Design a protein around this ligand. Structure first.
Ligand SMILES: CC(=O)N1C[C@@H](CO)[C@@H]2Oc3ccc(Cl)cc3[C@@H]21
Ligand SMILES: CC(=O)N1C[C@@H](CO)[C@@H]2Oc3ccc(Cl)cc3[C@@H]21
Length: 285
């Protein structure tokens, strides 16, 4: 079926939970043996969210190459994403090592450091120009260059230096700051505006390594971001945009990381975002 009318048909019939449970039943199951080794316990935030072995990002280290991060490679859309958990106190150096080694331009953050009164990720970037951060375990230096605070998101320019070679690179930090503590946003307008700002920066383009996107576990909000982006790109590429099947795209992405889209409300919100976005790309919003 088309998307917008499939959407109203699920609303009128109130069957979002059944649709979402079907997706959970059909999703791929691949091994995640490296994630479960005892030496990696303090490298995982949640015991039930792990990268598959076949798609995990490897650090360029011989001691321990493990990080909780996955490469999502979308062949028809010609887009790749790295989805990862929010960094832990003992993985902030690994996180920036990955950004460096994978040649990423941008980092997309979809959570606040504290939500619901609890810590959701480490404070892993510097908050003042004159107070830079040094990660001694991976030999990197990180400096805040500029910060632009807007009503729904903040963009930061960061300098990452490999202290071993003295090479430097500019990284863009795109921080969506207004996702609610509970539930999903009422309107997708600010989330779509944010997606378009990431696109306009070059951070999703083939002349760079894959964007790094995270929330707390790296599957819920993070899944919504890449699912919406890929579906909109396919609608632009194909002769028949109504052929884009958001459930099929989501199942394809779940071949590369488990659990993407965590609730039926996140699934409905993803439909809403693609539907509204497809009107702005052309003229009927
Ligand atoms: C650094 C810079 O000049 N630019 C312009 C665009 C590509 O030329 C990129 O989009 C953004 C957005 C936000 C920030 Cl802080 C920087 C950028 C980049
Ligand atoms: C492409 C798209 O569908 N959308 C949805 C709009 C809000 O409904 C978003 O913000 C922008 C801004 C500029 C452009 Cl070209 C596209 C958009 C987004």
């Amino acid at each position: 079926m088309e998307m917008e009318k499939e959407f109203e048909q699920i609303d009128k019939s109130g069957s979002w939970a059944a649709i979402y449970q079907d997706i959970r039943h059909e999703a791929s199951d691949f091994p995640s043996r490296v994630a479960k080794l005892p030496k990696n316990k303090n490298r995982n935030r949640y015991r039930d969210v792990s990268p598959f072995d076949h798609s995990r990002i490897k650090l360029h280290q011989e001691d321990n190459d493990y990080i909780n991060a996955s490469l999502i490679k979308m062949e028809e859309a010609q887009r790749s994403y790295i989805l990862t958990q929010g960094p832990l106190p003992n993985t902030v150096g690994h996180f920036w090592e990955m950004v460096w080694e994978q040649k990423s331009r941008g980092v997309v953050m979809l959570n606040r450091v504290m939500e619901k009164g609890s810590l959701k990720c480490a404070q892993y970037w510097p908050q003042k120009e004159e107070k830079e951060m040094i990660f001694e375990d991976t030999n990197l230096k990180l400096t805040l260059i500029s910060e632009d605070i807007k009503s729904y998101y903040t963009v930061r320019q960061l300098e990452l230096e490999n202290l071993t070679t003295q090479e430097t690179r500019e990284i863009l930090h795109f921080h969506y700051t207004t996702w609610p503590d509970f539930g999903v946003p009422e309107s997708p307008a600010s989330f779509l505006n944010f997606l378009f700002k990431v696109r306009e920066s070059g951070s999703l383009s083939p002349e760079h390594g894959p964007v790094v996107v995270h929330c707390s576990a790296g599957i819920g909000r993070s899944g919504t971001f890449c699912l919406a982006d890929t579906c909109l790109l396919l609608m632009d590429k194909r002769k028949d945009p109504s052929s884009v099947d958001i459930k099929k795209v989501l199942l394809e992405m779940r071949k590369f990381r488990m659990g993407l889209i965590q609730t039926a409300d996140q699934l409905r919100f993803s439909y809403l975002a693609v539907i509204e976005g497809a009107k702005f790309i052309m003229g009927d919003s």
